[PDB]
Amino acid sequence: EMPQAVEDFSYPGAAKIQAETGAILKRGNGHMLMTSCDGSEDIQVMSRTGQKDFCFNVMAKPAYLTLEVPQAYGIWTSADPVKTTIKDTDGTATVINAPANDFTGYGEAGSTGEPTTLIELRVA
Amino acid sequence: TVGDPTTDAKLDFTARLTIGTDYRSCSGALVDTQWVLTAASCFADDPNQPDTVAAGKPAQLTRATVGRADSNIANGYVREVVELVPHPERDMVLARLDKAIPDIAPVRLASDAPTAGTPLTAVGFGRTKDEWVPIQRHQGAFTVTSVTAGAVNVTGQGGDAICAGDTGGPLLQDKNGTLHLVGVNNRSMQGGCYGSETTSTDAIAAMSDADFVTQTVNRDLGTGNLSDLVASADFNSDGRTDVAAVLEDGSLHAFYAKLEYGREMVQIIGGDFNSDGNGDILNLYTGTATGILNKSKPMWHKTIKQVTRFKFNGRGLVAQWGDGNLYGYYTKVKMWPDATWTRLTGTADINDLTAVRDDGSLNWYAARKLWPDNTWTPMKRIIGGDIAVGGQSTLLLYGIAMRPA
């Protein structure tokens, strides 16, 4: 029996990504895609888990995707400001505003040394 | 729907709708400037069981953009949905907008189903083979595999499956530049989609329903403030006398007896005057097979008070003159020995010419009392064997409300 052709804003293929890269994805506005890192870099996320890293591509602005990546430590930006929400081990969340065309870190490689988790990645 | 992007003004009657902030999204198309047709499942808590999608306001704020083929530009119109009218049997709903979009034409509806082998096209804002959400809408190509009870089964031709976000999207079949809506996409195998894989390209769509739309879009033509210009005749060759009435738009609308509403001067009188099989409406407007009146012509080569229909020798009019006399016309005859005419009405097969006295009494001429009480004083333009506009200008049949409320 066929499924309804209705858009629920659940990231397509998220089940396979969890199996292959170790990252998990949930809901977004559909304008951010997970892709490979091969000269097509836009927003890059580095962590010490899963397959080490992965890249995302922005299709339109504004855009967001509430992906989850444990033990993240660094982010690269390009041609755009990036608003990143991370969470500590005590459940407290904070927001870091990263500048365009630069590199910033998170807790683990930041000011606190905490093994924080990426909760939300938002495009200006 | 996986195919070439299109922004041409052939499919600018399409629409994209969203419910809530990020709750649900699906496609649709215009059937009027005020009405957009989509699937009922888009508004369901469970899209696989669109039974609880009741008529009335949307559960969540629902908005739609029309004609915006390219999402990166401001081109197109944005309207809010105020009311929903679900189909009583199948997965289909009509959305009423707060405001009209008079600039964008609707798509015509098909008169019948496509058959197996028929080349159909489809357009929508759903997922592609490589994008979760597209920038521009895309057009695909499908063929009919079979037709079922109120639905059409289709398959992708050379791939191009119906995917996700295509629900509510139109199925189209064109001929000689004219596009007709043949159905609305509901479910699919979703093969060849971004983020997923399956071989099958099969999909199912609800069959287009012209009557459902007609009785919803035009649901409120009457019941409001109508003129007294009402007349009866058979305008659909059904064997049942229908009713036509003039509305505030200055046009004459036909309401068909089962009154259901159709699609398309001091006194008005109808009847099949020339025995042509199509009811007509001093100039005679002749009826045609399509229910549309032709250009009128003079019935002759100003002191008459009332004129109503009357059948003479199987075929006619009766005119009440200011002198109190009543004459029938085919050649004319005297209807009554003296000047004793009273409100003149049309005829009906009571067993006969109906009439109303100034004292409110109703009677008929072969007069004899036709109604136990005397409450017909305020009644005007009584038409025909069942037989008044009423004090609220709502036609009653003798007094049942033939008109909806």
XYZ file of C-alpha atoms in Angstrom:
529
model
C 0.000 0.000 0.000
C 1.317 3.444 -1.039
C 2.176 6.228 1.486
C 0.666 9.721 1.330
C 2.706 12.225 -0.685
C 2.711 14.794 2.132
C 5.702 16.840 3.265
C 6.333 16.417 6.991
C 9.649 18.296 6.929
C 11.479 15.210 8.225
C 14.984 14.992 6.759
C 14.935 12.496 3.810
C 17.254 9.520 4.260
C 17.965 10.353 7.909
C 17.668 6.656 8.768
C 20.485 5.761 6.375
C 22.678 8.610 7.531
C 22.499 7.423 11.125
C 23.729 4.040 9.917
C 26.504 5.410 7.677
C 27.864 8.674 9.132
C 26.610 8.345 12.709
C 24.902 11.740 12.587
C 21.157 12.027 13.055
C 18.722 14.534 11.599
C 15.137 15.505 12.349
C 13.162 18.533 11.171
C 14.029 21.620 9.130
C 12.594 23.970 6.521
C 14.044 21.847 3.731
C 16.654 24.310 2.475
C 19.668 22.528 3.954
C 21.071 19.293 2.567
C 23.760 16.945 3.849
C 26.444 16.419 1.232
C 30.021 15.299 0.691
C 33.138 17.377 1.393
C 34.944 17.690 -1.954
C 35.462 21.284 -3.115
C 31.773 22.013 -2.516
C 32.171 23.043 1.106
C 29.741 25.577 2.551
C 29.093 24.865 6.224
C 31.405 22.199 7.621
C 31.089 20.396 10.939
C 33.932 18.582 12.695
C 33.495 16.154 15.595
C 35.313 13.227 17.197
C 32.482 10.783 16.514
C 30.792 9.057 13.586
C 32.768 9.486 10.366
C 34.752 12.457 11.766
C 33.172 15.120 9.574
C 30.563 16.099 7.009
C 29.380 19.147 5.002
C 26.051 20.884 4.462
C 24.895 22.994 1.525
C 22.530 25.961 1.703
C 19.881 26.060 -1.028
C 18.115 29.243 0.056
C 18.025 31.783 2.875
C 16.831 31.826 5.603
C 17.353 28.163 6.393
C 17.664 25.839 9.356
C 17.996 22.182 10.272
C 17.813 20.742 13.783
C 20.480 18.078 13.376
C 22.236 16.405 16.284
C 25.983 15.811 16.430
C 27.569 14.576 19.713
C 31.018 15.748 20.790
C 31.435 18.549 18.236
C 34.511 20.772 18.445
C 34.829 22.945 15.329
C 32.947 24.697 12.521
C 33.920 26.340 9.236
C 31.834 29.081 7.645
C 31.764 30.519 4.127
C 30.092 33.537 2.501
C 27.587 33.662 5.362
C 27.214 34.235 9.142
C 26.210 31.108 11.047
C 24.097 30.892 14.203
C 24.867 27.744 16.165
C 23.115 26.325 19.214
C 24.981 23.841 21.386
C 24.118 22.098 24.643
C 26.175 21.075 27.671
C 26.014 17.817 29.607
C 23.796 19.441 32.234
C 21.088 20.154 29.647
C 21.853 23.890 29.410
C 21.898 25.361 25.904
C 23.802 28.388 24.616
C 24.210 30.237 21.320
C 27.426 31.054 19.484
C 27.433 33.535 16.612
C 30.180 32.630 14.154
C 31.523 35.198 11.617
C 31.575 34.509 7.881
C 34.654 33.076 6.160
C 36.341 32.057 9.400
C 36.811 29.198 11.866
C 35.457 28.882 15.402
C 35.324 26.169 18.055
C 32.956 24.735 20.652
C 33.300 23.944 24.373
C 35.756 21.062 23.846
C 38.143 23.290 21.874
C 36.612 26.522 23.138
C 36.718 28.417 26.430
C 35.055 25.839 28.694
C 36.556 22.530 27.548
C 33.104 20.936 27.744
C 32.128 18.013 25.420
C 29.047 19.772 24.074
C 26.493 18.599 21.514
C 25.296 20.388 18.387
C 21.544 20.963 18.647
C 20.632 23.437 15.914
C 22.376 24.853 12.866
C 20.801 28.024 11.475
C 21.566 30.043 8.349
C 21.195 33.827 8.486
C 7.398 14.755 -9.753
C 10.827 14.651 -11.479
C 11.182 16.528 -14.751
C 12.019 19.888 -16.284
C 11.374 23.107 -14.293
C 8.645 25.265 -15.783
C 7.645 28.864 -15.162
C 5.516 29.377 -18.269
C 2.028 30.894 -18.156
C 0.295 27.622 -18.935
C 0.408 26.231 -15.423
C 0.196 29.461 -13.429
C -3.087 28.294 -11.911
C -1.166 26.043 -9.547
C -0.641 26.722 -5.862
C 1.496 25.731 -2.889
C 0.070 25.604 0.620
C 1.512 25.277 4.100
C -0.148 24.471 7.407
C 1.250 25.921 10.621
C 4.924 26.892 10.730
C 6.501 23.532 9.889
C 3.652 21.100 10.557
C 2.588 20.102 7.033
C 3.040 21.131 3.393
C 1.431 20.042 0.089
C 0.344 21.218 -3.376
C -2.914 22.393 -4.971
C -4.526 24.264 -7.877
C -7.185 26.914 -8.475
C -10.762 26.108 -9.454
C -11.873 29.711 -8.973
C -10.309 33.033 -7.984
C -11.555 32.426 -4.438
C -11.238 28.642 -4.336
C -8.260 26.278 -4.355
C -8.611 22.512 -4.701
C -6.297 20.198 -2.748
C -6.301 16.890 -0.857
C -8.168 16.451 2.424
C -5.293 14.465 3.920
C -3.184 17.663 4.191
C -5.464 18.794 7.017
C -5.736 15.443 8.787
C -4.052 14.430 12.031
C -3.439 11.166 10.205
C -3.084 11.682 6.407
C -3.794 7.997 5.806
C -7.218 8.379 7.402
C -8.775 11.665 6.103
C -12.132 10.962 7.753
C -11.993 13.563 10.523
C -11.336 16.452 8.165
C -14.561 18.301 8.962
C -15.942 21.353 7.177
C -15.176 24.733 8.730
C -12.097 26.736 9.678
C -8.606 25.125 9.377
C -7.286 23.642 12.634
C -4.038 25.544 12.116
C -3.322 28.746 10.242
C -3.157 27.774 6.588
C -1.732 29.931 3.826
C -1.189 29.480 0.113
C 0.848 31.131 -2.611
C -0.515 31.154 -6.136
C 1.394 31.441 -9.409
C 4.776 31.680 -7.680
C 6.609 29.288 -9.977
C 9.955 30.510 -8.609
C 10.221 30.751 -4.813
C 13.179 33.161 -4.913
C 11.079 36.007 -6.326
C 8.020 37.926 -5.130
C 6.022 37.032 -8.239
C 2.634 35.558 -7.364
C -0.118 36.171 -4.834
C -0.409 35.252 -1.171
C -3.768 34.436 0.381
C -5.014 32.989 3.663
C -7.429 30.064 3.912
C -10.555 30.756 5.937
C -12.816 27.749 5.339
C -12.559 24.141 4.194
C -15.192 22.116 2.336
C -14.269 18.366 2.299
C -15.623 15.890 -0.226
C -18.264 13.571 1.370
C -16.708 10.392 -0.071
C -13.085 10.790 -1.202
C -9.772 12.447 -0.320
C -10.474 15.902 -1.698
C -11.089 19.321 -0.123
C -11.955 22.791 -1.381
C -10.186 25.660 0.351
C -11.885 29.046 0.530
C -9.573 32.048 0.518
C -10.147 35.300 2.407
C -9.566 37.287 -0.784
C -9.773 36.568 -4.513
C -6.950 36.503 -7.042
C -8.699 37.931 -10.164
C -5.423 38.012 -12.073
C -4.903 34.244 -12.221
C -7.338 32.021 -14.096
C -8.462 28.620 -12.694
C -8.089 25.325 -14.536
C -11.113 23.866 -16.313
C -12.459 20.555 -15.051
C -12.657 17.350 -17.094
C -16.051 16.086 -18.246
C -15.050 12.429 -17.811
C -12.219 10.076 -16.826
C -9.054 9.371 -18.864
C -8.725 5.750 -19.974
C -5.773 3.370 -19.856
C -2.979 4.418 -22.208
C -3.896 8.117 -22.051
C -0.857 10.487 -21.700
C -1.330 12.687 -18.619
C 0.909 15.375 -17.172
C 1.369 16.636 -13.629
C 2.853 19.690 -11.945
C 3.721 20.342 -8.314
C 6.077 21.675 -5.641
C 7.134 18.329 -4.180
C 10.527 16.667 -3.775
C 12.867 15.937 -6.665
C 15.450 13.220 -7.281
C 18.194 15.388 -5.775
C 16.501 18.153 -3.754
C 14.477 18.029 -0.547
C 12.776 21.312 -1.427
C 12.917 22.766 -4.984
C 13.299 26.400 -5.970
C 10.968 26.122 -8.951
C 7.939 23.933 -9.628
C 8.394 20.989 -11.997
C 6.309 19.217 -14.625
C 6.342 15.457 -15.190
C 4.642 12.924 -17.482
C 2.495 9.931 -16.524
C 0.278 7.355 -18.210
C -3.028 5.860 -17.100
C -2.872 2.181 -16.208
C -6.485 1.750 -15.143
C -9.611 3.490 -13.862
C -11.340 2.536 -10.617
C -14.296 3.559 -8.463
C -13.863 7.332 -8.283
C -10.108 7.314 -8.860
C -7.488 6.935 -11.580
C -4.354 4.793 -11.398
C -1.262 6.145 -13.142
C 2.405 5.281 -13.561
C 5.496 7.329 -14.397
C 6.752 7.194 -17.978
C 10.516 6.660 -18.120
C 10.769 7.189 -14.364
C 9.361 10.434 -12.972
C 7.328 9.131 -10.044
C 4.960 11.115 -7.858
C 6.948 11.699 -4.650
C 6.241 13.802 -1.555
C 4.684 17.254 -1.373
C 2.764 16.340 -4.518
C -0.398 15.554 -2.559
C -3.190 17.820 -3.706
C -1.351 18.497 -6.959
C -3.402 18.379 -10.199
C -3.401 15.737 -12.903
C -3.861 17.367 -16.271
C -4.895 16.381 -19.775
C -4.710 18.935 -22.574
C -6.269 19.118 -26.026
C -5.735 21.851 -28.624
C -4.277 24.191 -25.990
C -7.101 23.632 -23.489
C -6.197 22.127 -20.121
C -8.614 20.069 -18.045
C -8.189 18.752 -14.510
C -8.683 14.998 -14.473
C -7.705 14.248 -10.872
C -5.779 15.099 -7.690
C -2.694 13.210 -6.444
C -3.116 11.424 -3.116
C -0.582 8.607 -2.697
C 2.521 7.247 -4.426
C 5.396 4.749 -4.320
C 7.855 7.669 -4.289
C 10.541 6.000 -6.407
C 13.506 8.053 -7.631
C 13.233 10.578 -4.741
C 15.951 12.391 -2.849
C 16.787 10.496 0.345
C 14.969 7.264 -0.592
C 14.787 4.440 -3.120
C 12.253 2.077 -4.687
C 11.713 0.744 -8.209
C 7.990 1.406 -8.590
C 6.750 4.721 -10.001
C 3.053 3.988 -9.469
C 0.624 6.535 -8.008
C -3.088 7.043 -7.341
C -5.177 10.191 -7.704
C -8.756 11.099 -6.810
C -10.988 11.569 -9.837
C -11.960 15.173 -10.599
C -15.490 16.074 -9.528
C -17.136 18.908 -11.463
C -20.413 18.729 -9.531
C -18.689 18.827 -6.151
C -16.912 22.011 -7.158
C -19.946 23.591 -8.832
C -22.235 23.180 -5.822
C -19.553 24.586 -3.516
C -18.145 27.486 -5.510
C -21.628 28.653 -6.512
C -23.241 27.482 -3.264
C -24.268 31.029 -2.359
C -25.531 32.415 -5.676
C -29.051 32.531 -4.247
C -30.590 32.460 -0.715
C -29.708 36.159 -0.378
C -31.354 39.228 -1.893
C -32.892 38.185 -5.221
C -35.155 40.042 -7.632
C -38.779 39.052 -8.216
C -37.857 37.959 -11.730
C -38.475 34.228 -11.403
C -39.817 31.763 -13.989
C -40.224 28.013 -14.463
C -39.407 25.664 -17.368
C -37.460 22.487 -18.178
C -33.949 23.776 -18.891
C -32.055 20.478 -18.730
C -34.345 18.128 -20.664
C -34.944 16.114 -17.479
C -38.748 15.954 -17.506
C -38.758 18.047 -14.334
C -39.693 21.713 -14.398
C -36.760 23.856 -13.263
C -36.555 27.399 -11.907
C -34.645 30.381 -13.259
C -34.139 33.646 -11.374
C -32.336 36.955 -11.826
C -29.703 37.883 -9.251
C -28.146 41.232 -8.305
C -25.559 40.744 -11.058
C -28.281 41.344 -13.666
C -27.910 37.805 -15.014
C -30.390 34.943 -15.192
C -29.291 31.779 -13.406
C -30.835 28.326 -13.756
C -31.532 26.168 -10.709
C -32.353 22.552 -11.531
C -35.120 20.472 -9.949
C -34.288 17.075 -8.391
C -33.117 22.993 -6.308
C -29.444 22.495 -7.283
C -27.582 25.405 -8.817
C -26.485 25.394 -12.450
C -23.444 26.963 -14.095
C -25.206 29.481 -16.427
C -36.972 43.431 -17.632
C -40.100 43.951 -15.463
C -41.631 40.477 -15.698
C -40.126 37.152 -16.735
C -41.964 34.148 -18.188
C -40.644 30.818 -19.453
C -41.994 27.610 -20.972
C -41.378 25.634 -24.159
C -43.296 28.085 -26.322
C -42.216 26.650 -29.664
C -42.205 23.031 -28.469
C -38.460 22.755 -29.194
C -37.702 20.534 -26.181
C -35.694 23.295 -24.490
C -37.449 25.750 -22.178
C -37.470 29.386 -23.293
C -37.769 32.759 -21.487
C -41.936 41.348 -25.377
C -38.996 39.303 -26.758
C -38.541 35.532 -26.741
C -35.234 34.018 -25.652
C -35.014 30.557 -27.173
C -33.519 27.657 -25.225
C -30.801 25.355 -26.544
C -29.417 21.887 -25.785
C -26.643 23.406 -23.666
C -29.077 25.217 -21.358
C -27.914 28.552 -22.766
C -30.418 31.057 -24.141
C -29.915 32.469 -27.630
C -30.453 36.032 -28.858
C -34.078 37.053 -28.386
C -36.538 38.328 -30.971
C -39.845 40.315 -30.776
C -42.967 38.187 -30.343
C -45.061 40.895 -31.998
C -44.978 43.947 -34.320
C -47.865 48.670 -22.678
C -51.397 48.770 -21.140
C -51.038 45.199 -19.874
C -50.595 44.758 -16.126
C -49.523 41.115 -15.894
C -48.400 38.358 -18.250
C -48.118 34.676 -17.341
C -47.759 31.333 -19.139
C -50.735 29.268 -20.308
C -50.866 26.128 -22.445
C -53.309 26.268 -25.357
C -54.145 23.114 -27.320
C -50.938 21.488 -26.072
C -48.662 24.509 -26.821
C -48.959 30.273 -24.896
C -49.571 33.404 -22.785
C -52.372 35.036 -20.815
C -52.348 38.801 -20.370
C -54.274 40.759 -17.766
C -55.170 44.192 -19.074
C -55.657 47.389 -17.065
C -59.373 47.247 -17.914
C -59.834 44.106 -15.785
C -60.109 41.747 -18.770
C -58.016 38.619 -19.309
C -57.093 37.364 -22.783
C -55.200 34.310 -24.015
C -52.762 34.463 -26.918
C -51.461 31.820 -29.353
C -55.124 34.760 -32.622
C -56.524 35.624 -29.160
C -59.362 34.338 -26.979
C -61.366 35.675 -24.040
C -60.463 33.892 -20.802
C -63.388 35.244 -18.783
C -66.855 36.648 -19.806
C -66.309 39.942 -17.953
C -63.689 42.283 -16.477
C -63.227 40.485 -13.157
C -59.383 40.299 -13.107
C -56.866 40.094 -8.956
C -53.242 38.868 -9.143
C -52.461 36.752 -12.204
C -50.187 33.736 -11.763
C -48.936 30.903 -13.959
C -50.686 27.562 -14.443
C -50.248 24.132 -12.875
C -51.785 20.704 -13.417
C -53.802 20.817 -10.202
C -56.318 18.198 -11.450
C -55.631 25.089 -14.329
C -54.953 28.826 -13.788
C -54.059 29.944 -10.274
C -54.933 33.368 -8.892
C -54.635 35.442 -5.725
C -57.339 37.767 -4.422
C -56.656 41.025 -2.590
C -58.143 39.423 0.527
C -55.309 36.854 0.579
C -57.449 33.984 -0.711
C -55.942 31.550 -3.231
C -58.036 29.876 -5.933
C -57.918 28.310 -9.388
C -59.885 28.538 -12.635
C -60.916 25.534 -14.770
C -62.954 29.595 -9.400
C -62.450 27.140 -6.512
C -60.604 27.618 -3.218
C -57.043 26.293 -3.413
C -55.700 27.043 0.090
C -57.469 26.630 3.520
C -56.181 29.995 4.780
C -55.907 33.513 3.341
C -52.180 34.228 3.638
C -51.242 34.855 0.003
C -51.635 38.639 0.148
C -47.836 39.402 0.201
C -47.038 36.720 -2.374
C -45.613 37.815 -5.719
C -44.834 36.139 -9.046
C -46.350 32.755 -8.268
C -45.097 30.111 -10.697
C -46.044 26.515 -11.601
C -48.974 19.832 -10.583
C -46.886 21.607 -7.906
C -46.956 25.430 -7.613
C -44.444 32.477 -4.559
C -41.222 34.451 -3.893
C -42.240 34.834 -0.236
C -41.841 37.662 2.289
C -38.114 36.903 2.449
C -37.808 36.593 -1.337
C -37.182 32.851 -0.981
C -39.135 30.689 -3.398
C -41.468 28.222 -1.712
C -43.221 25.291 -3.355
C -46.818 24.387 -2.433
C -44.442 26.044 1.347
C -41.247 23.945 1.235
C -37.873 25.665 1.012
C -36.754 24.599 -2.456
C -33.731 26.847 -1.964
C -30.838 25.844 0.385
C -29.915 27.674 3.612
